[PDB]
Structures are given as structure tokens and as C-alpha cells.
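Re-run with default settings, no changes from the original entry. Doing this only to confirm the output is reproducible before filing.
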Amino acid sequence: SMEQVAMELRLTELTRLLRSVLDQLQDKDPARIFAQPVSLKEVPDYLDHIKHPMDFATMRKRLEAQGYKNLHEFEEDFDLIIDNCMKYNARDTVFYRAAVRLRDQGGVVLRQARREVDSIG
């Protein structure tokens, strides 16, 4: 149908906008602490602690399969990255501190993305 196509065009534009958001968020992690999943070879107990692991590469695979229906789903995944880190790592660690920073700096980008998603429909 013509409708399904219009729908698919919006998802594709949402995907385009979310890709730009994702690159902006990931620039706020210049150390690449959140780039890749936590290694289960190197942290074998990790899933005893964290039930829903997340990272920027895993978000990117989902993004490119157009797997985010709306900004809210994307934000959920970004928040997992931050929240998992803040639980698994103690406060006085480079990792925890890196999450605090990504959260604070990401909020600006996420604020505008919400306005652009509402604005452009």
C-alpha cells in the first residue's frame, strides 16, 4: 500500500535523525568506554550483576535494522548504557565518572532531538 510506504519513509527519516543523535552522543565518550559490549571473557560474572547490557555498537546494529520505533526506545537504550555502568562500577572509578559525564552532556542533545521529533512529526 501507499500508506505502508509513507510509514516506511517516516521510519527511515527517524532512523536518519537517530543516527545523527547517536553520533553526537558517542562523541561525548572520547575514551570509548561505552563503544562495545562489556567482555564476558574479561568480566565473566557480569550478567549476575547486569541483566540488560547495552553499548553503542549494539545500539548501532539495532538502529541500522530500523529497530527503533520512536525516540523513547532509543533513550531507553542510552539510559541502560549509563545506568548499568553506575551500578557495576563504584563512584570513585574512571568508568562511573565517564557515565556521569556522558549523561550530563547527552541531555542537551536529547533535549533538542525530542523537540525535532515532535516538530517534524
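Helices lie at 2-27, 46-49, 56-64, 71-88, 94-119. The first helix runs from residue 2 to 27.
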